[PDB]
Nucleic acid binder design. Structure first.
Ligand SMILES: [Zn+2]
Ligand SMILES: [Zn+2]
Ligand SMILES: [Zn+2]
Lengths: 103, 71, 149, 1168
RNA sequence: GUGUAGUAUCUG
RNA sequence: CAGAUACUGACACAGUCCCUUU
């Protein structure tokens, strides 16, 4: 999520595990959040795939249903050679409306 | 912050970078790239009557401290 | 962004609109035109249409010394998208002009731009480095590139 | 203006070599990798020669190459680490005759960066893991395994990063069924960047670190790290586990050391030194390569020094502890980059500069005469080199790797220009001559007075292995002969050859039928003659001979049908046909063993229409298809093996058509308005055709590719197949009113070479415009001239005599009268700033020097030219630029001199006239307008001839850097800088002033340039880029020049020339690479073809990824973005895929695969 | 209609 | 330090609780 300047990416390593995407975000770029021309698959480090974190969506974290992908700009710019893009942060715009709507 | 990616990669400078550590990295990168291309080493081995192994050994040895000692 | 490869024919029409878009107007105009230029340069990469991209590059550079996060976030993206369609050789000349500036706010921005250029296409900068003469006691000249057959 | 990049010759520069069972059977193949080309080749164990099986391209440089096999397997895999930034595992498929992608893992960015794995690659000998490491901080380890699917698997990579560490070499330690262990040579430099005094730069040792792979906890940790005494360069693995000890064989400078982890001593045996070395006694001795011949009975090792001397390392041990190392000098070979000890006593040597050899081992070196060294001897060993006495040469592979200069010109009495390349380096340099065609070999020459026109050679029996029958036919007379290595006149043939012979058929297994104008006479091996006389005044025209049937035609189109029977009796049909024209050209296909006979017969007529008549008697004498031709055909022939047909026309053109009763694909090409005949020949056990014209032509079908290549020989009119014991495969052909024998040995290729030996490395040469001679010059660093070497040897062999011992020193007498050669034993490299130059004049026709001029010490020749001045008449002066005390790395000189010769007596003499001293080294000499332009470093000057020296007329100082090139045209001259691309300066003769007006923006490391017509300079680059710079039309002859072309060949280019290559061709842009490749940059003609080619290239960019895996557009944009260039190798690669993928690629453009292939070959066959 | 970051201008 | 008026980021909207255990 490039809109929130609070989220922190992982950038540990690649692997043989393929990321998954949920219904809320099916054809969105992992970094660009675009909608055009998926090009390459997404790999995640073993630290991001273990037990309760297995088969979860990369951006939000819901039950994944379809494979993730990279847009053509990310392939031309070689932005996929960084590691895994899994978000390791809870966020501030998604963990506050909970307590705001509790009342 | 967008400085996370720029920090984990060596050779990245900042606002308090002195010329010496810029030039030593500039020379080290060239030395590393010399051994990559085969024709870039053929040219060096033909320019001076030496062998490829000797040129590679000299290039590896010169990487310990190029551009002299610091200040 | 949508047309992609087909933008090499309508490249001339938008230029005398970005030209007066990159003026001293509100920040929104220059913020949006930076993304426009980024997509425009990324869509035509590899087809040899850098003649107009070089002219367009002369307007993005003045709008780098800003403070709002959005405008700089767009301008750095535009510069990164232009550096792959034009080449690191042209960007290095612009960046090296004020690297060792005697101020600090300009030096920080120039070093950030240099780091952005340095991370990508690392090996492509070997042949584009300038020549620096020797000081009192140091070796600053790559003598291995002066060999003549 | 768009350009199309084709290729003519592929690079032959070997960098890596591996061996193993890459096929699956019990035969070992060699996988040799070029600079960016993956190649496979295997040697024949029965004859020793080596063939080629695959030359696939990977589109990217290769930095490592390793081979491994799984446990309990029988197939070898290939692991490739390259600039792609990934790791690739390949597999050879004999059925598909092509590689197979298996795995692909990404672990970083792309480019030869510092922290990027891919440089050093090591594999576990047992085949359980693989380690790929960078030059610094980026060690990575994978875990290979096999699963229930019998397929290779790759696990997640394991990081082993370590900051501030330089890696020299990585090798895999051999352990027997334990955890994998790897070794590396680290050297920290953190403390060297914090002490301004510089004392930390020295006294810094490097350690031998062993890395432990925990196979139960899935992590890698380092255990042992001990400092060393002196620096090393590479390591050799030792077979351990259950067969021999485990350890390393670190090869430091002037020493070899064995070290093992745990508790074990060390062994240091000094390297043997050559006896009475003529070089400076302060140069270290190091190894360059190694080998391994591990065998269950006994194992040894190999090594090679700087001078190219093979040793034999044997270890001594009792149970685990190694006691001593026993060296022994094996042989002497040219310096190589890799060796492969092959089974069955074969050794493969791949030289780094020159041809590639292949030796066989007769003796293993047991109970020799020379002693063996050991570490037990206290305290500078010596040995005496000698001829081989242990190996023999059985094969040599040509390779024009180090090409420094090229020039295409026509000097002989023909129309096809030849290539005069100046390749080679060192004492084994040569200047080869390249011409299109094949190599011609002859065995014997015989004189046959008269006027023969044809000859036949058919086996007596179908089971015969030696050809016997020869029927030499004159215009009317005949003369039967035979081949038995004693070819003479034969009489007992009993053929009654008193009539002209038109054919010699093979009707049955051994039945032969002769043709005479009065009928048909059968001639069986047994006394069974079936003669059929034909009364009348009209004779026979031709006859369609075949292995099972005969078809004949008479004057006016009177068909006669013949068919044989198993009993052995002839037959004839009772139907006769009528024709609308006359019989001119015939053809007949072969019969496969799987069918009773052929399918159809081809008949040609005057109306230029081919007629197809079936052989079935039910519908015999009935045409099926009709097709006219633009011109009258002359001869016809059919080739087999998917089958195609060849159509020969009256003029010099040959047409190729696929085998089909109805008309189909047409392939038109030029064969010179003369009749062309096509016969059946044999090659390597395969069928081929042979066309004869003003020049001989040979066409062969091999792996779905057709090459129409001529023969480098004079005019020929007839040829025939040949096979015997003396020659492996030859050709029986006749000559102009005489007899000859032709032989072919080399595999099908182009650019035949004839080598002229030289003495040093040629720098530049020029061609005399009147006597077509050469002014070749030479210059090499670290060398001694013919006089200094002799005087140094004489002085050295005098002080050692008076060594206070026995007055009885007679070895000087035996030493001064025997000098070893230099082309096999290397050269005595001495000094650090020594030079030697030689000026040579050579006849391009045959190799024989005309004059030799030897310069004195520390004089390097850098430029030569031939000029003619104005104040003097026809006086061809020769100017040579000579430096003085040139040191390379700390560049500093003390001036130079320019020589001047006269070149009298039409090109075989040279007298010294005078020399002019200069304060800087000259590099560019260019004559123009009866004067000479001299570029002395930064300064630029113009000189004029005087009486004792040269006069300086004009001076200009505006070049930013060192001048390394000058070319002149009209009033505009171009100065090639070393960092700036180009500088345009104009010379005016009114006030004698040089002014610069136009320059370039992007700096370039230009090495050569060539103006195309008037304003575009086709330059080059030191890194591989090729660019074209054009000046704007509105320039006032501050004003930059635009760039219209950019590309990245990937190899250094030092030759550019625009000259037609074939008669009737066009203007090309032939260049030459630094590895041995020749390419062209031909442009497009029409506009509807450029779009098709661009679409094909764009579609293949995604439908056919590179073998290693890398963006082709990014690869071609390595330094500068591509511009107005379309790759042609990728387009030509379309011919090699699967049929379904071919159809899928073709269907978008609404074309058939034959339609795409035909024009792809047509564009190539037109410009070259 | 509401909430989650960021930015510009006048006045006190 | 505060108030007011405009603006940007294809920002998100009972989001739902998925080792918290006897
Ligand atoms: Zn989601
Ligand atoms: Zn993206
Ligand atoms: Zn992760």
């Amino acid at each position: 999520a490039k809109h929130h300047p609070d989220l922190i990416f992982c950038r540990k390593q690649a692997g043989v595990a393929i990321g998954r995407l949920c219904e809320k975000c099916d054809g969105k770029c992992v970094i660009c959040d675009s909608y055009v021309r998926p090009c390459t698959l997404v790999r995640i480090c073993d630290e991001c795939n273990y037990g309760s974190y297995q088969g979860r969506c990369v951006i939000c974290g819901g039950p994944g249903v379809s494979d993730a992908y990279y847009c053509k700009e990310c392939t031309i710019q070689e932005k996929d050679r960084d590691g895994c893009p899994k978000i390791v942060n809870l966020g501030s715009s998604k963990t506050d409306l909970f307590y705001e709507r509790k009342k | 912050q967008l400085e996370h990616l720029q920090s984990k990669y060596i050779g990245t400078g900042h606002a308090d970078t002195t010329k010496w550590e810029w030039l030593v990295n500039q020379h080290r990168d060239s030395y590393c790239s010399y051994m990559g291309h085969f024709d870039l080493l053929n040219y060096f081995a033909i320019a001076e009557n030496e062998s490829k192994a000797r040129v590679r050994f000299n290039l590896m040895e010169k990487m310990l401290q190029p551009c002299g000692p610091p200040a | 962004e949508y047309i992609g490869e087909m933008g090499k024919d309508y490249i001339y029409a938008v230029t005398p609109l970005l030209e007066d878009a990159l003026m001293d107007r509100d920040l929104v105009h220059r913020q949006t035109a930076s993304a426009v230029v980024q997509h425009m340069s990324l869509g035509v990469y590899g087809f040899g249409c850098e003649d107009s991209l070089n002219h367009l590059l002369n307007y993005v550079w003045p709008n780098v010394f800003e403070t709002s996060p959005h405008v700089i976030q767009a301008v750095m993206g535009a510069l990164e998208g232009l550096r792959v369609a034009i080449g690191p050789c042209r960007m290095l000349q612009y960046c090296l002009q004020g690297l060792f500036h005697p101020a600090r706010k300009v030096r920080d921005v120039y070093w950030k731009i240099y780091n952005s250029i340095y991370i990508g296409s690392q090996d492509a900068l070997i042949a584009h480095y300038p020549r620096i003469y020797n000081d009192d006691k140091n070796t600053y000249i790559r003598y291995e590139l002066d060999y003549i057959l | 203006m768009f350009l199309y990049n084709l290729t003519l010759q592929r690079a032959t520069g070997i960098s890596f070599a591996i061996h193993g069972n890459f096929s699956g059977t019990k035969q070992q193949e060699i996988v040799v990798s070029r600079g960016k080309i993956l190649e496979l080749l295997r040697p024949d164990p029965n004859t020793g020669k080596v063939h080629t099986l695959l030359t696939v391209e990977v589109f990217g440089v290769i930095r490592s190459l390793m081979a491994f096999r799984l446990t309990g397997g029988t197939k070898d895999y290939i692991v490739v680490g390259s600039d792609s930034g990934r790791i690739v595992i390949l597999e050879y498929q004999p059925s598909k005759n092509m590689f197979e992608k298996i795995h692909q893992e990404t672990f970083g960015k792309s480019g030869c960066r510092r922290i990027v794995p891919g440089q050093f690659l090591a594999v576990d000998p047992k085949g359980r893991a693989v380690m790929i490491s960078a030059i610094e901080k980026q060690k990575l380890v994978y875990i290979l395994n096999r699963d229930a699917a019998a397929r290779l698997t790759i696990s997640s990579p394991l990081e082993a990063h370590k900051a501030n560490t330089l890696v020299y070499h990585v090798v895999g330690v051999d352990v027997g069924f334990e955890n994998p262990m790897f070794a590396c040579l680290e050297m920290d430099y953190e403390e060297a960047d914090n002490d301004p005094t510089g004392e930390a730069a020295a006294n810094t040792q490097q350690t031998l670190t062993f890395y432990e792979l925990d196979l139960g906890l899935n992590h890698v940790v380092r255990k042992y790290s001990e400092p060393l005494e002196e620096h090393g360069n590479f390591l050799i693995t030792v077979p351990g586990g259950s067969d021999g000890p485990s350890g390393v064989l670190i090869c430091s400078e002037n020493y070899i050391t064995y070290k093992n982890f745990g508790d074990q001593p060390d062994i240091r045996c000094p390297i043997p030194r050559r006896r009475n070395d003529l070089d400076d006694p302060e140069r270290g001795m190091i190894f360059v390569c190694s080998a391994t011949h591990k065998t269950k009975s006994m194992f040894f090792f190999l090594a090679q020094t700087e001078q190219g001397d093979i040793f034999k390392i044997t270890l001594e041990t009792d149970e685990d502890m190694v006691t001593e190392i026993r060296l022994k000098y094996f042989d002497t070979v040219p310096v190589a980059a890799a060796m492969c000890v092959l089974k069955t006593g074969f050794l493969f040597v791949a030289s780094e500069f020159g041809n590639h050899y292949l030796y066989q081992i007769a003796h293993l070196g047991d109970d020799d005469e020379e002693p063996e060294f050991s570490s037990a001897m206290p305290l500078t060993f010596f040995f005496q080199p000698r001829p081989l006495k242990n190996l023999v040469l059985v094969d040599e592979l040509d390779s024009l790797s180090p090409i420094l200069f090229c020039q295409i010109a026509d000097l002989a009495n023909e129309d096809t220009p030849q290539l005069y390349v100046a390749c080679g380096r060192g004492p084994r340099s040569s200047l080869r001559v390249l011409r299109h065609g094949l190599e011609v070999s002859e065995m014997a020459v015989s004189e046959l007075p008269g006027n023969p026109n044809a000859v036949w050679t058919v086996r007596r029996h179908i089971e015969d292995e030696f050809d016997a029958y020869i029927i030499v036919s004159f215009v009317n007379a005949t003369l039967v002969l035979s081949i038995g290595e004693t070819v003479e006149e034969v009489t007992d043939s009993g053929f009654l050859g008193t009539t002209p012979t038109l054919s010699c058929s093979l009707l049955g297994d051994d039945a032969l039928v002769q043709v005479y104008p009065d009928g048909i006479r059968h001639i069986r091996a047994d006394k069974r003659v079936n003669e059929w006389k034909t009364p009348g005044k009209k004779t026979i025209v031709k006859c369609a001979v075949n292995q099972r049937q005969v078809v004949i035609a008479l004057t006016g189109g009177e068909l006669v049908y013949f068919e044989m029977d198993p009993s052995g009796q002839l037959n004839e049909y009772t139907e006769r046909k009528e024709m609308s024209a006359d019989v001119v050209c015939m053809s007949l296909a072969n019969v496969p063993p799987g069918e009773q006979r052929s399918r159809f017969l081809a008949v040609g007529l005057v109306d230029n229409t081919v007629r197809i008549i079936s052989l079935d008697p039910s519908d015999c004498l009935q045409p099926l298809s009709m097709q006219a031709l633009p011109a009258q055909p002359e001869s016809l022939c059919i080739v087999e093996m998917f089958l195609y047909l060849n159509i020969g026309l009256q003029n010099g053109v040959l047409l190729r058509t696929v085998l089909d009763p109805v008309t189909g694909d047409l392939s038109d090409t030029r064969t010179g308005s003369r009749p062309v005949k096509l016969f059946r020949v044999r090659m390597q056990g395969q069928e081929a055709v042979l066309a004869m014209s003003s020049r001989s032509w040979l066409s062969y079908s091999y792996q779905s590719r057709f090459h129409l290549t001529p023969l480098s020989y004079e005019t020929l009119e007839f040829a025939s197949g040949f096979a015997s014991e003396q020659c492996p495969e030859g050709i029986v052909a006749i000559s102009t009113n005489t007899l000859r024998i032709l032989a072919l040995e080399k595999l099908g290729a182009v650019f035949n070479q004839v080598a002229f030996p030289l003495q040093y490395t040629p720098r530049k040469f020029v061609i005399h415009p009147e006597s077509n001679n050469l002014i070749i010059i030479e210059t090499d660093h670290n060398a001694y001239t013919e006089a200094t070497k002799a005087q140094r040897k004489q002085q050295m062999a005098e002080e050692m005599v008076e060594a206070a011992g026995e007055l009885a020193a007679e070895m000087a007498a035996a030493f001064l009268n025997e000098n070893l050669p230099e082309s096999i034993f290397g050269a005595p490299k001495a000094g650090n700033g020594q030079w030697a130059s030689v000026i040579r004049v050579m006849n391009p026709i045959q190799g024989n020097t005309l004059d030799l001029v030897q310069l004195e010490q520390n004089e390097a020749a850098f430029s030569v030219a031939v000029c003619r001045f104005s104040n003097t008449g026809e006086d061809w002066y020769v100017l040579v630029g000579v430096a003085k005390d040139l040191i390379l790395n700390p560049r500093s000189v003390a001036g130079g001199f320019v020589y001047t010769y006269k070149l009298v007596n039409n090109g075989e003499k040279l007298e010294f006239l005078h020399k002019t001293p200069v304060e800087e080294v000259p590099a560019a000499i260019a004559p123009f307008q009866g004067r000479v332009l001299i570029g002395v470093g930064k300064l630029l000057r113009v000189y004029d001839l005087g009486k004792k020296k040269l006069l300086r007329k004009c001076e200009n100082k505006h070049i930013a850097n060192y001048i390394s090139g000058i070319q002149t045209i009209g009033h505009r001259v171009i100065v090639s800088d070393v960092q700036e691309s180009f500088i345009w300066v104009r010379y005016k003769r009114n006030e004698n002033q040089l002014i610069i007006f136009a320059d370039d923006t992007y700096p370039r490391w230009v090495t050569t340039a060539s103006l195309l017509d008037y304003d575009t300079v086709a330059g080059a680059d030191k890194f591989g880029n090729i660019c074209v710079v054009r000046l704007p039309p509105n320039t006032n002859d501050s004003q930059k020049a635009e760039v219209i072309m950019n590309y990245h060949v990937g190899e250094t280019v030092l030759s550019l020339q625009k000259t037609t290559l074939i008669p009737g061709g066009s203007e090309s842009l032939v260049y030459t690479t630094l590895s041995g490749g020749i390419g062209i940059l031909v442009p497009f003609t029409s506009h509807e073809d450029h779009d098709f080619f661009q679409h094909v290239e764009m579609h293949l960019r995604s439908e056919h990824p590179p073998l290693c895996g890398r963006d082709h557009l990014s690869f071609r944009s390595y330094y500068f973005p591509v511009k107005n260039v379309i790759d042609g190798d990728l387009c030509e690669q379309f011919n090699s895929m699967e049929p379904n993928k071919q159809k899928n690629v073709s269907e978008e453009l609404d074309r058939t695969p034959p339609e795409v292939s035909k024009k792809l070959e047509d564009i190539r066959t037109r410009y070259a």
